[PDB]
């Protein structure tokens, strides 16, 4: 099936007038439905819309480092159009120099991806959480504080664990692609290096090759020991080996929805 | 070599009088060298000894979980005898029902443990943090909120990352054993189920060799592809190879230091 695609988090950074700082700070105090703390004239913090939006202002940090002085954070999938309009009119519009600092792509699949092998052709860090079973439940590729980070994990299990309403599907896995700083502008093709695979090594006829791969695919630590020219050889081979690569479906769904998603972004920037 | 062993964290939980709550709350306010916040009559938080000791009191949250109402947290390796005596006299003594909630065993090794891994006789959950190189830096066995949790990680790398003074040894790895709640009393012979192992093939110097074996050990059909002259080379190699189990050295060092460690505990409970 085609995976559902959506933005899953958005950060927006901007700068705020002396006049507007207060104006906005003033406004917020009057509304009991917003939660205010860490207040000074140069500082404030806030959560709004039943704690779905984080809002932070700090000028002295902003002056200390040559940066923008207000962030707004939230997940658009959990906001109501009504709400989105409220937030734009009452917060975002009053920011200047405003743009995106974060942007997350969420591909939901109704398959089980435990059984796929997820890989980057690039030489980066990883993290794997295994279940009691010895099988993987959550995978991270890259590091969170970076231009690009990827999670692949069992959404069903994660939703169940979070006491969310249970799901009609028998399997549900997400593939989240966190784009920060300048990478946000390339969201429409950000999983070029990424592949989600599953091959059948038997059908291959070179013997040492098959062993070597089989090991790489069954002890992730063994990548750590391999010479760099070697790493590339086996990266090549892995990709070269598998029939169905879900990358292709992702790229497709992305293209199919590029225009809507694009509009959805444009909305915030006007 | 024999690994250095020590307790690496201690939590102490107790209960505090109405009288003593204030008394202590009063005492602390007078010392500018201790940092007080989140104050109510039922609540208070504090860090002392240059932020090395956390201290938290909460009556409303003690009973709401059916526990004792004050924690004191700290790493004994980073405290001065002077300091330890200060803390006992000015804090711990005024607690009643006092006992240990947490206790961590730290085995430092001057070897490289990258290729070693732990297994209980259970198939518990796991976490592995890999470096950019593809090698493992940190391994977790179990879950942190439990009677028992184990970290094995590169202390050298972790100390370097923490901007600690660099170390004369070329390798330094720790094996931390976090014991909580009732398990603390059994710090002393846990390893009937447990082994810190290196599998057969891991022990080999040679990448191609170790791959080839791993495959032979995990796919029966791969013998069928191999002329006899090869089979023997790997037959030879297999027999030639043993698992290394560090458990034994740990049990030993533990026994060797049981009495000191035991005294070191007794100190706090008087």
Numbering used by the authors:
A (entry chain A), B (entry chain C): 39 to 308
Article, verbatim:
Despite low overall sequence identity, there is a high degree of structural conservation between the catalytic domains of the Rep proteins from these Geobacillus stearothermophilus and Staphylococcus aureus plasmids. Structure-based sequence alignment reveals the conserved residues are almost exclusively located in the β-strands containing the Rep_trans motifs, and it is likely the crescent-shaped catalytic domain represents the canonical fold for the Rep_trans protein family.
This was then used to aid the structure solution of two staphylococcal Rep variants, RepDE and RepDN (containing the 21 kDa fragment of RepD fused to the 14 kDa fragment of RepE or RepN, respectively). Molecular replacement with the RepSTK1 coordinates was also unsuccessful, but manual docking of fragments of the RepSTK1 model into the RepDN density allowed further interpretation of the RepDN electron density maps. The relative orientation of the catalytic domains in RepDN is intermediate between those observed in the other two proteins. They still form a ‘horseshoe’, but are rotated 5° towards each other relative to the position in RepDE, reducing the distance between protein chains at the open end of the ‘horseshoe’ by 5 Å.
